[PDB]
Amino acid sequence: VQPDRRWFGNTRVISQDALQHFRSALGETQKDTYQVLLRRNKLPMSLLEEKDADESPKARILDTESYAD
């Protein structure tokens, strides 16, 4: 592998406006049964799949009190 500065650059970036657009759009999509997925767009889905939840997970009790204690 030759030395090259292309290896150390970013390959994909996304702007805040695009993030807001896709975050709002994911949720306003209405699936039709007669539309099939021909090709999926490439997106940072971990960034985009953020949902408000009514409840929080339970706390970790082993941090304050171990088994030996």
């Binding site: 592998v1 030395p3 090259d4 500065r5 290896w7 150390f8 650059g9 970013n10 390959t11 994909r12 970036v13 996304i14 702007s15 805040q16 993030l19 090709r39 999926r40 490439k42 940072p44 971990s46 960034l47």
Partner: protein, 230 residues
């Protein structure tokens, strides 16, 4: 009996009349017994005995050092203390892999007379939306058990490893043919999704794709290890 009945029994009745003396003589015989075991145990048990003896001696030396050290005697904010955690690539040159090693000849026909199908013996990344070609025209075989989607990426900054999805295969150093087949061997450059690392460019853009180099042999250890190229 209920609760701590053996302790209550010892309190109310004592022990066997030879308990202390017998225990004392056993502890005195321990030095001879340890020497006899070290010289008499054979094979796997002997090797394990020597290994455990070395570990115990190391532990004792560390305890002595800590005792004598005790007897002699990042600039984080308030909410982060009391909490715990050249453009050269790291592998400029890797072992050459020939086509004989890379591919396995698959024989076809009732008497096995045809030999045109080839199977890739290494791990591959086939990309999104992969559908197998029809069996009559399928020359290159990339079996589903050897297809990978995610890799363990180590960031040189902050020294953390994360399980990241694979976006593409950029450069397999063996051949551009292996690059276009998606072969993941040691030294292969891959594109990884770095969304959970929270990287931002100088212009405020969020980085979600970067390059990494594969540092192991997934055909030998069953997983993909890569170091991020920063």
């Amino acid at each position: 009996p209920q609760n701590d009945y053996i302790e209550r029994h010892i309190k109310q009745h004592g022990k066997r009349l030879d308990h202390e003396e017998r225990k004392r003589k056993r502890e005195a015989r321990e030095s001879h017994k340890i020497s006899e075991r070290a010289q008499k145990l054979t094979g796997w048990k002997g090797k394990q005995f020597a290994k455990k003896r070395y570990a115990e001696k190391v532990s004792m030396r560390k305890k002595i050092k800590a005792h004598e050290q005790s007897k002699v005697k990042d600039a984080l904010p308030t909410y982060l203390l009391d909490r715990e955690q050249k453009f050269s690539v790291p592998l400029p040159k890797v072992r050459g892999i020939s086509e004989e090693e890379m591919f396995k000849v698959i024989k076809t026909g009732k008497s096995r007379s045809k030999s045109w199908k080839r199977m890739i013996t290494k791990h591959t990344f086939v990309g999104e939306g992969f559908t197998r070609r029809p069996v009559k025209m399928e020359r290159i075989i990339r079996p589903s058990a050897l297809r990978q989607k995610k890799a363990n990426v180590t960031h040189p900054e902050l020294g953390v490893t994360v399980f990241l999805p694979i976006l593409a295969v950029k450069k397999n150093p063996q051949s551009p043919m292996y690059t276009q087949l998606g072969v993941l061997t040691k030294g292969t450059i891959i594109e990884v999704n770095v969304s959970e690392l929270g990287m931002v460019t100088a212009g405020g853009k969020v980085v979600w794709g970067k390059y990494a180099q594969v540092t192991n042999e997934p055909d030998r250890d069953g997983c993909v290890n890569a170091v991020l190229l920063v």
